[PDB]
């Protein structure tokens, strides 16, 4: 269910790497989730905190990981904000337009974080945001 998605032994290894008193902080749990190839947002983090507080047992941590699976994510879902700014419907946005979107709203990235991500995808100024989305989903 979650094991379909991620490596079972890495789940335990990353837990042991970060646990303290047999518990793991939400920040370390989200770090681990990312290493396992999952994508938590602040919504997932607020949700697990409301259930259990800031420090998760191993079992609560596994629950948190299932919450982070997000098997509904796909390109259609991801591009919506970008497409909305693509007034002329070209399929492209400039790096500046994309950096502004990523750093201004939502779980905003720092300027550097956005720059690194956009540069990692392409050396060109005009970005195919659908392909950019396919790439981050990997």
């Amino acid at each position: 269910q979650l094991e379909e998605k991620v490596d079972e032994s890495d789940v335990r290894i990353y837990f042991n790497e970060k646990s303290s008193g047999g518990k793991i902080s939400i920040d370390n749990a989200s770090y681990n989730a990312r290493k396992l190839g999952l994508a938590p947002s602040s919504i997932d983090e607020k949700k697990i905190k409301e259930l259990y507080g800031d420090n998760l047992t191993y079992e609560q941590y596994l629950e948190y990981l299932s919450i982070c699976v997000h098997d509904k994510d796909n390109v259609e879902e991801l591009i919506k904000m970008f497409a909305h700014f693509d007034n002329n419907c070209t399929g492209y946005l400039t790096k500046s337009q994309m950096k502004n979107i990523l750093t201004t709203w939502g779980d905003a990235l720092t300027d550097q974080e956005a720059i690194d991500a956009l540069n990692a995808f392409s050396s060109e100024d005009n970005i195919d945001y659908k392909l950019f989305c396919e790439d981050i989903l990997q």
């Binding site: 994508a39 947002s41 879902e77 919506k80 690194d116």
Partner: peptide
Amino acid sequence: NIXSLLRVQAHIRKKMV
């Protein structure tokens, strides 16, 4: 739009790690 943006930012943070 905003919820979709969070999923974008989430996958970007995943790639950083």
